[PDB]
């Protein structure tokens, strides 16, 4: 059966081949043969977004 924890796989694609790096750019995995490239996946709870909920309610008729 489906989960009930409001969690979904958060996929993040990294392409730093232009050379711009930050602390998170090293140490997370080997880069051998795929310099600058990484796929990150983690399970995160998807929270309510009051600001977006209010915005849709007020703005939905504007494409």
């Amino acid at each position: 059966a489906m989960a009930k924890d409001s969690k979904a796989p958060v996929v993040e694609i990294f392409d730093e081949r232009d050379g711009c790096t930050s602390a998170g750019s090293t140490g997370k995995a080997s880069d051998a043969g795929e310099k600058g490239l990484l796929v990150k996946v983690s399970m995160q709870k998807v929270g309510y977004n009051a600001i977006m909920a209010k915005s849709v309610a007020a703005s939905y008729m504007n494409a």
């Binding site: 489906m2 796989p9 958060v10 996929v11 309510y48 977004n49 909920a53 939905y60």
Partner: protein, 176 residues
């Protein structure tokens, strides 16, 4: 494949980081491995855009959903709907990353029709929101959206766009 299975089963927020030889292997065993990374990015980097536009279009085509006691009347129900749209969108993105829909079907879809039935979540609006996300994802994968663009080497991503559309079709069938 076991790296993702570990962090998905634990579901504790620990991340799998796939680079180097692990990444070369990931792409080797799926079709269009590099283009698939771009297609996945085209979805996840636009998640808030996709979700807000789909739920907004669902309501503007059927404003009864936001009338008093409607499906998304009040901020709490609207927020829960936007949350659901993103939850679905992200399981589709993971399906496109992995090349199969098993986690989408097992963790997200299995029993979802019954859950929505009991809650009174209207399946018509639900299907329409999914259909708009499907069409929006299609444009982004093909880089044919009107405003937001993705810069990638020129080529044809029709196959990945069809595969993504098929994962959305699995959602539509589960939503009934």
């Amino acid at each position: 494949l076991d790296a993702f299975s570990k962090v998905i089963t634990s579901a504790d927020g620990k991340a799998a980081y796939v680079g180097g030889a692990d990444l070369q292997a990931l792409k080797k065993f799926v079709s269009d491995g590099n283009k698939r990374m771009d297609a996945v990015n085209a979805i996840v980097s636009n998640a808030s855009c996709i979700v807000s536009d789909a739920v907004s279009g669902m309501v503007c085509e059927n404003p009864s959903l936001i009338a008093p006691n409607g499906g998304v009347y009040s901020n709490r129900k609207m927020a829960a709907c936007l949350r659901d749209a993103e939850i679905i969108l992200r399981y589709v993105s993971y399906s496109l990353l992995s090349g199969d829909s098993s986690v989408l079907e097992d963790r997200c879809l299995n029993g979802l029709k019954e859950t929505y039935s009991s809650l009174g979540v209207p399946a018509a609006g639900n299907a329409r929101a999914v259909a708009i996300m499907k069409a929006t994802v299609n444009s982004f994968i093909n880089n044919t959206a009107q405003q937001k663009k993705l810069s990638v080497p020129s080529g044809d991503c029709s196959a990945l766009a069809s595969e993504a559309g098929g994962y959305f079709d699995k959602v539509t069938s589960a939503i009934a």
